[PDB]
Amino acid sequence: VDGVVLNGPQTDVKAGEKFVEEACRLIMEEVVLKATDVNEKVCEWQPPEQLRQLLDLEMRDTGESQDKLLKLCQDVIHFSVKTNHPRFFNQLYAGLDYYSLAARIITEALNPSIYTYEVSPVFLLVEEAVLKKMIECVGWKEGDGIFNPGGSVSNMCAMNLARYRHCPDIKEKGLSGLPRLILFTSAECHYSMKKAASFLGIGTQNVYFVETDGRGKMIPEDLEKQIWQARQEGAVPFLVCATSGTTVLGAFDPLDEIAEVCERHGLWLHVDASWGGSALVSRKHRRLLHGIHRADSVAWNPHKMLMAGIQCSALLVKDKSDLLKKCYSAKADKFYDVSYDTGDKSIQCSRRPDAFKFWMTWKALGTSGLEERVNRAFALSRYLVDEIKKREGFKLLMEPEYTNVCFWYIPPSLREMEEGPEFWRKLSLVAPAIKEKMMKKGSLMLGYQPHRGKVNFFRQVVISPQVSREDMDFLLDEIDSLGRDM
Amino acid sequence: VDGVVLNGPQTDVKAGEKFVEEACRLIMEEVVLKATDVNEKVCEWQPPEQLRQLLDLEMRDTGESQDKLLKLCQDVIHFSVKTNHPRFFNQLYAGLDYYSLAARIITEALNPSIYTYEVSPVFLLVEEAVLKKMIECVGWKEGDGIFNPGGSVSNMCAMNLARYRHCPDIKEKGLSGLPRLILFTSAECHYSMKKAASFLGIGTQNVYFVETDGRGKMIPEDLEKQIWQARQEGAVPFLVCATSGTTVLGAFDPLDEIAEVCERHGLWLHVDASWGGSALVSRKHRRLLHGIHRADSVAWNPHKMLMAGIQCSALLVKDKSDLLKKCYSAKATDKFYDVSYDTGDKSIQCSRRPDAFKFWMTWKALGTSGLEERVNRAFALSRYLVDEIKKREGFKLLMEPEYTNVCFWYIPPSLREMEEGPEFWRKLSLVAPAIKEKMMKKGSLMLGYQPHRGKVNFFRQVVISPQVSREDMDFLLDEIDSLGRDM
Ligand SMILES: *Cc1c(COP(=O)(O)O)cnc(C)c1O
Ligand SMILES: *Cc1c(COP(=O)(O)O)cnc(C)c1O
């Protein structure tokens, strides 16, 4: 010693290291080992103003003792939704993949960023591997891609690419003097298509929506109409965005008949497979994405159907001439193959190795194990279907094309009624009220939402391979019980 | 009963439960407990084609037994860079905060998304807490914000906000019929300002750069000049982006004199404090961002100076009328709780992680006082290395640092008796890349070297981790000197 302004190490490491070991056990005791126990509440509901009185969130000038901090962690787990609980069907993700989680913890400790090979050599070789594999599942011989934070941004990137490819001078000039650029998507499209059009300075008014048929599928005959009208307005079409697996219904646009339309006019074709993309793993169901190999770009989120954990979404491009680079290049030599850097393919600088956790799963299960996981979801989906039809008071909107089982629950008081406006206006308030109860019970969680002209209906999503047939029987047994007297 | 179309389960949990327990212990033994040990290699260098031949990355139809898988994890750590090693100064982050890691692991197991209160009640109350606290450090009375994946997106989001405020019809009509929108930033700005300008359909040609003085600081007299020229071209200025802590030099634009220029013309003022933002925690050094409370929006990444872990970047807005919402809304789908506590329509993202929770865990564990002291020690260690660099010969300092960005050349002995002419620089250029090549093969150090705005290859040092000691600074210069003495 010493110096100014006072030097040493000043740290209480060996204690702070225990807090990490103690947190690890909380994960094991209170999450990992209780992950498959159906006998636990999916959520400990407490309104906002009551949960504030339970957590002590104020960050004061002084710290808190290790006991008080371990209490917070004890509570943070107790009061949060259990996304791993087998009875969690509230989102397009659920369950706990043990192998992806172990990889997830690793990434957290190393705390790597994927600027370049010199900081993340392993994880950059893994992203190369995963992207190459995914590109095979699509059917391309070569390609290119990056991992974005959420398939929402993946679509944004693909929209920005289709604009750069159409007129790469937009990167420098901007859109001031350019005519109206127009993209075409289905009205069943994710809403990130809307945020994107605005964000990229294209405007939501320039997102032409193509009519869908009775199954939620885009109609390629109409698309030709919308592309000629756009031109005849003086506007410049440049992109078509189909969806292979919508969020609500799980529909699958016909990519082979859309590709034939995009190729007649030379328009980028982007397929939003954030949800249905994982079906490409199954030889049995990968036909849902027939013709995807004719698109120019594909979005795919493994954190959904394959339980990679949040976040994990990839954008794949059919190019190999560094178009990704040519589009996202900016400022910044020796001494290694600089090709293995990717800092200038993305809009972000820092980035986490989202693709590594998936790699850990694919190694642990192989394509064969992932194939079975996707296929089983379809079985459990179609099982719930067969059981829903047996019951009265459960109306199915349609046979699902994916694992999105959309149905109403009609209480007995509303049966023998007539299919008129007055009937719907009352059926509307059923799902939201059945959701209020199952959230206070902590025994179930399903999504309710309107769609198109349809009023509040349920959407069920089978993903986790811990779900059992008995978890589907309980779904209908539970909803029935909570809405029997409504 | 058992029946069609193939039912069970048949998952073999108890194995998957070991792999998690075994990985947890692997983390403890080989990372957490070895975090501060300086005598270990900062990195196990192996080129791609040799590291590819060592990891076996191929994803086959079949899986691999847990023993090979536990080997994989063992190798991934052995060959990866140790960002927690105290002698890691290669980027604007480093070190291991044990408390943020515990929070990182917690978030990791729950695997939550922050759509709404019904999915992430806790983490939404935590994000409200952090945002409110941060907004005080800025000096605002009230505000609004969200956590983005990386300060790059924070700048992108703030730039899109200023455009919505300037003409909110751009959200629907777009930019087709509108005149040229122009923003003004410093040439010392992060490059996400260029990526953003392109991405948002504004165009890089419309990013006017204001000249910098000898300290790297924007010159408010020029800023006024560029706004009159821009307008006199028929173009429409709408945003000014100052930087409170540049990446290379660590400069701090003068926010009070820039704000006065933005207020005379009614232009959004955005401060890129992704790096220097953490200085607001220090009463001594928070003067570097004097006048930030006059800006309309602030970006601030705790995953850097405060060691929150990646990723963690916040966008703060001076509004309270749900401008963030009004701008990033797509009301795509009501009782029975206060929907105000949802944030799904404030972001450009749909799904989102609780980046702010790990920081909250640190602030709780250390208090504002602990965060203040950690920031100050970095400043001291910076000024120590500075004073030590001047004592040594062969080390030329580009300038006195305003932050913890210590930029210096290393002049091998062969070039110390030369003259300060062109040929001198041209040879000095290849010094840093070759001194970096060795320390990466030695595995004993990692700091960044880069050219800059006409300066030739020089080193950049970033003091962050409070595990760094004077002995880690003396070794920095002793090591660089040793590796380049024979050049
Ligand atoms: C889930 C989804 C997205 C994007 O989801 P993120 O979690 O934001 O990545 C986009 N489109 C569809 C059809 C989706 O299901
Ligand atoms: C570190 C830094 C950033 C970081 O952006 P990321 O996308 O989070 O990596 C942006 N701007 C400046 C000035 C920075 O120092």
Numbering used by the authors:
A (entry chain B): 11 to 342, 349 to 502
B (entry chain A): 11 to 343, 349 to 502
What does the paper say about this structure?
PLP-dependent decarboxylases constitute a large family of enzymes that catalyze a range of metabolic reactions. Compared with CSAD, the activity of GADL1 towards cysteine sulfinic acid (CSA) as a substrate is much lower, and GADL1 has a stronger preference for aspartate, suggesting that GADL1 may be involved in the biosynthesis of β-alanine and its peptide derivatives, such as the neuro­protectant carnosine.
In this study, we describe the crystal structure of mouse GADL1 (MmGADL1). The diffraction quality was initially poor, with diffraction limits of around 6–7 Å and highly smeared reflections. Thus, the structure of the nontwinned crystal form is discussed here; essentially all features can also be seen in the twinned crystal. The overall fold of MmGADL1 is similar to those of CSAD and other close homologues, with a flexible loop, not defined in electron density, from the apposing monomer covering the active site, which is possibly relevant in catalysis. Importantly, a large part of the active-site cavity wall will be formed by the flexible loop in the substrate-bound state; the flexible loop is invisible in most PLP-dependent decarboxylase crystal structures, but harbours a Tyr residue that is likely to be important for catalysis. While our GADL1 preparation is enzymatically active, and the crystal is apparently fully occupied with covalently bound PLP, we cannot currently rule out the presence of PLP-deficient GADL1 in the purified SAXS sample, since crystallization might have enriched a cofactor-bound conformation of the protein. While the molecular mass calculated from the forward scattering intensity accurately matches that of a dimer, the theoretical scattering curve calculated from the crystal structure differs significantly. The shape in solution is more elongated than in the crystal.
